[PDB]
Amino acid sequence: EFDITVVIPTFKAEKTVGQCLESVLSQQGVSTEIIVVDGGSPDATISIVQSFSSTNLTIISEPDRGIYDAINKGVSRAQGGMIGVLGADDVYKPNVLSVVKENASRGVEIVAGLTLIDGQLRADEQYRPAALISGIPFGHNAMFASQEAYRKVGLYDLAYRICADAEWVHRAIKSDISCRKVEQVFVEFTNPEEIIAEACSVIQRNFPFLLKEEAKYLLYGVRGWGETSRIEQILRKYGHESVLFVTALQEAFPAVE
Ligand X SMILES: CCCCCCCCO[C@@H]1O[C@@H](C)[C@@H](O)[C@@H](O[C@H]2O[C@H](C)[C@H](O)[C@H](O[C@@H]3O[C@H](CO)[C@@H](O)[C@H](O)[C@H]3O)[C@@H]2OC(C)=O)[C@@H]1O
Ligand Y SMILES: Nc1nc2c(ncn2[C@@H]2O[C@H](COP(=O)(O)O)[C@@H](O)[C@H]2O)c(=O)[nH]1
199 binds ligand X (CB under 6 A): yes
Taking the alpha carbons at both ends of the chain, their separation in whole angstroms is 50
d(CA 206, CA 243): 12
d(CA 248, CA 53): 48
- Exposed, middle or buried: residue 136 (CB in 10 Å: 0-12, 13-18, 19+)? buried
- Tell me the chain's radius of gyration from C-alpha atoms: 19
Name the residue nearer to ligand X (CB basis): 57 or 234: 234
Among ligand X, ligand Y, none, partner that 199 touches (CB below 5 to 8 angstroms by kind): ligand X
Pick between residue 2 and residue 189 the one whose CB is nearest to ligand X: 189
Site for ligand X in 112-151 (CB under 6 A): 122-123, 135-136, 139-140
Residues that bind ligand Y (CB under 6 A): 9-11, 13, 37-39, 64, 66-67, 70, 87-89
Question: Out of ligand Y, ligand X, none, which partner does residue 39 contact, by CB within 5 to 8 A per kind?
Answer: ligand Y
- Choose which of 38, 165, 188, 214 interacts with ligand X (CB under 6 A): 165
CB 108 within 8 A of CB 178: yes
Residue 54 to residue 40: CA distance in whole angstroms: 20
Residue closer to ligand X, measured from CB, 96 or 163: 163
Kindly list the residues in this chain that would bind ligand X in the complex (CB under 6 A).
Answer: 122-123, 135-136, 139-140, 162-163, 165-166, 192, 195-196, 199, 220, 225
